[PDB]
Amino acid sequence: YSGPKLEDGKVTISFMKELMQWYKDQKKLHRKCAYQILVQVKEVLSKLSTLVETTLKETEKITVCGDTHGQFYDLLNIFELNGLPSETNPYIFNGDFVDRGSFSVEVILTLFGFKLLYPDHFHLLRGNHETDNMNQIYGFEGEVKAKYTAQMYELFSEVFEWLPLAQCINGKVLIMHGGLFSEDGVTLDDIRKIERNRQPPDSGPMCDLLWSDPQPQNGRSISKRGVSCQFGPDVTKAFLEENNLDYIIRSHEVKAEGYEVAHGGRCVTVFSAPNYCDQMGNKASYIHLQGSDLRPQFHQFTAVPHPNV
Ligand SMILES: O=C(O)[C@@H]1[C@H](C(=O)O)[C@H]2CC[C@@H]1O2
Ligand SMILES: [Mn+2]
Ligand SMILES: [Mn+2]
């Protein structure tokens, strides 16, 4: 085994560069190294609030990416286009790192490696795919068992339970994978108090955060997904006004251009898996925000070649 090795048990920037090249060339990280990343990132995540609150000073920026779906070569493309994560190049990946794509293991351990490397500047939010149910059906359980073992998969499942559910920047922008709620009156404080270290329930705020979608017309509809709801611009406007918020950013839906701005500016979708499942032909995008100007700046990109699996 001449693969990447942690230095004194810990992730370093040179380990992360070696790991990305290793994965680029389709090689597997040793199980003992994958195990150390998982137990260590579980500990880092378990100390976070369910709502991560982040302050961006006037001169600080952050990049927000949407779903990635084990599209590891597209993830490398993001880092090449936009730079490696660092203290001065922070990132938020807004759920759905795994399932669907064929390199879910490579995506998730690269993201976990950077969460360990820059814990205050690299943020992972839970999506509907970071759950047992989904993973058993849509490929991630299957991939982890093939490359490692069922026991490794059980450990991934436990780390995923500690992923925070939402992030608020400057008390003004709220980010979550799915969207807003099936009921009026939910506050930031209610989100903060969600006991999240579980599989989501079938209904309620934790479910909505991971599963809801915006709709154009006023009101709420029963979701065509079978879980949670669709919420109209009246919902978003009420929620933003009660919580003193400017807009929300969410992901969870494929968009031809890689993004959409709904609800008159108030509900942004960002989606980061270009040519999703090698079939959709969509562009992806990521968002820039800065402390002095939280209006979203969209950066479009397209799919890059990946090994034929
Ligand atoms: O997030 C979702 O549920 C949707 C799909 C999924 O994750 O199952 C995928 C395609 C568009 C969105 O991302
Ligand atoms: Mn989703
Ligand atoms: Mn998704």
Side-chain angles (χ1 to χ4, degrees), residues 67-69 95-96 98 100 128-129 177 225 251-253 271 276:
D67 308 30
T68 46
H69 288 298
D96 280 17
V98 301
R100 301 314 221 278
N128 62 313
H129 282 266
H177 178 70
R225 299 180 189 258
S251 299
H252 187 55
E253 293 186 276
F271 189 78
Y276 170 68

Side-chain angles (χ1 to χ4, degrees), residues 63-69 78 91-98 123-130 165-167 173-180 207-215 225 229-231 247-256 258-263 266-274 276 282-287 289 296 298 301:
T63 296
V64 185
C65 298
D67 308 30
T68 46
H69 288 298
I78 295 167
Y91 276 81
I92 301 159
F93 283 87
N94 191 23
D96 280 17
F97 321 124
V98 301
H123 299 99
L124 300 166
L125 305 184
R126 204 177 174 176
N128 62 313
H129 282 266
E130 284 72 46
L165 293 186
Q167 179 150 6
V173 179
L174 179 68
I175 306 171
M176 75 285 286
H177 178 70
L180 293 180
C207 177
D208 296 335
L209 279 159
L210 299 177
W211 279 99
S212 68
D213 300 300
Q215 55 176 28
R225 299 180 189 258
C229 75
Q230 299 161 201
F231 58 97
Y247 62 105
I248 64 175
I249 295 169
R250 49 82 71 164
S251 299
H252 187 55
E253 293 186 276
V254 61
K255 287 315 170 182
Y259 71 101
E260 175 168 320
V261 183
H263 295 182
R266 284 168 188 88
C267 181
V268 174
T269 297
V270 63
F271 189 78
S272 309
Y276 170 68
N282 63 290
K283 306 181 178 91
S285 78
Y286 54 80
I287 299 180
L289 316 178
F298 298 100
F301 63 103

Side-chain angles (χ1 to χ4, degrees), residues 1-23 27-37 40 113 116-117 148:
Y1 185 82
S2 65
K5 282 287 167 171
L6 303 165
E7 311 185 31
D8 302 324
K10 305 219 158 170
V11 173
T12 62
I13 200 244
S14 53
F15 169 89
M16 291 308 306
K17 290 164 161 167
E18 294 177 9
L19 183 70
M20 295 178 292
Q21 186 61 59
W22 197 247
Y23 280 166
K27 294 162 172 152
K28 188 162 75 199
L29 183 61
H30 192 94
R31 57 187 143 76
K32 313 211 179 180
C33 290
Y35 168 93
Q36 279 197 282
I37 290 171
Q40 293 185 38
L116 288 174
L117 190 52
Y148 296 113

Side-chain angles (χ1 to χ4, degrees), residues 9-258:
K10 305 219 158 170
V11 173
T12 62
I13 200 244
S14 53
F15 169 89
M16 291 308 306
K17 290 164 161 167
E18 294 177 9
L19 183 70
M20 295 178 292
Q21 186 61 59
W22 197 247
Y23 280 166
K24 189 165 158 165
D25 295 322
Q26 308 185 70
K27 294 162 172 152
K28 188 162 75 199
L29 183 61
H30 192 94
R31 57 187 143 76
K32 313 211 179 180
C33 290
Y35 168 93
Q36 279 197 282
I37 290 171
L38 293 173
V39 300
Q40 293 185 38
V41 91
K42 187 182 208 208
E43 161 82 14
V44 170
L45 293 177
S46 70
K47 307 311 207 189
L48 304 174
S49 184
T50 298
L51 174 71
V52 176
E53 297 177 84
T54 300
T55 303
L56 232 48
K57 300 169 165 321
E58 29 258 275
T59 63
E60 290 181 329
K61 64 202 270 218
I62 196 150
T63 296
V64 185
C65 298
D67 308 30
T68 46
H69 288 298
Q71 292 181 22
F72 173 74
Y73 295 83
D74 295 315
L75 177 68
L76 292 196
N77 192 48
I78 295 167
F79 293 153
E80 274 161 30
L81 289 173
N82 186 55
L84 290 173
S86 74
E87 314 96 329
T88 62
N89 196 211
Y91 276 81
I92 301 159
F93 283 87
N94 191 23
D96 280 17
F97 321 124
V98 301
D99 280 343
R100 301 314 221 278
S102 300
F103 315 98
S104 295
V105 168
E106 294 76 11
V107 166
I108 193 62
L109 290 174
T110 302
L111 299 175
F112 283 167
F114 287 117
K115 180 73 189 156
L116 288 174
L117 190 52
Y118 306 110
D120 297 337
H121 291 100
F122 193 83
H123 299 99
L124 300 166
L125 305 184
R126 204 177 174 176
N128 62 313
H129 282 266
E130 284 72 46
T131 59
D132 266 25
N133 263 8
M134 307 294 288
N135 289 168
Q136 288 163 174
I137 296 161
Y138 293 107
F140 180 63
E141 187 200 28
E143 186 182 332
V144 179
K145 287 199 218 173
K147 297 179 174 174
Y148 296 113
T149 58
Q151 282 188 261
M152 184 80 82
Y153 167 71
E154 309 319 314
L155 181 46
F156 272 118
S157 153
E158 306 175 353
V159 166
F160 283 166
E161 288 181 342
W162 285 113
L163 288 163
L165 293 186
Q167 179 150 6
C168 186
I169 315 323
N170 298 1
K172 289 299 172 217
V173 179
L174 179 68
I175 306 171
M176 75 285 286
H177 178 70
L180 293 180
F181 300 92
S182 290
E183 318 297 330
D184 290 329
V186 180
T187 62
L188 293 175
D189 200 55
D190 292 332
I191 296 172
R192 196 156 27 219
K193 287 172 166 154
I194 286 166
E195 178 194 309
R196 72 181 188 277
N197 58 308
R198 51 172 299 168
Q199 303 296 307
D202 212 354
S203 77
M206 177 178 178
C207 177
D208 296 335
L209 279 159
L210 299 177
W211 279 99
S212 68
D213 300 300
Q215 55 176 28
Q217 73 268 34
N218 283 316
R220 291 183 169 82
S221 301
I222 288 168
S223 174
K224 32 245 260 271
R225 299 180 189 258
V227 37
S228 194
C229 75
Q230 299 161 201
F231 58 97
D234 50 353
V235 172
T236 306
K237 191 177 188 293
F239 178 91
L240 296 170
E241 182 197 332
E242 184 178 11
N243 288 295
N244 252 275
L245 287 173
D246 291 342
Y247 62 105
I248 64 175
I249 295 169
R250 49 82 71 164
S251 299
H252 187 55
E253 293 186 276
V254 61
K255 287 315 170 182
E257 289 304 310

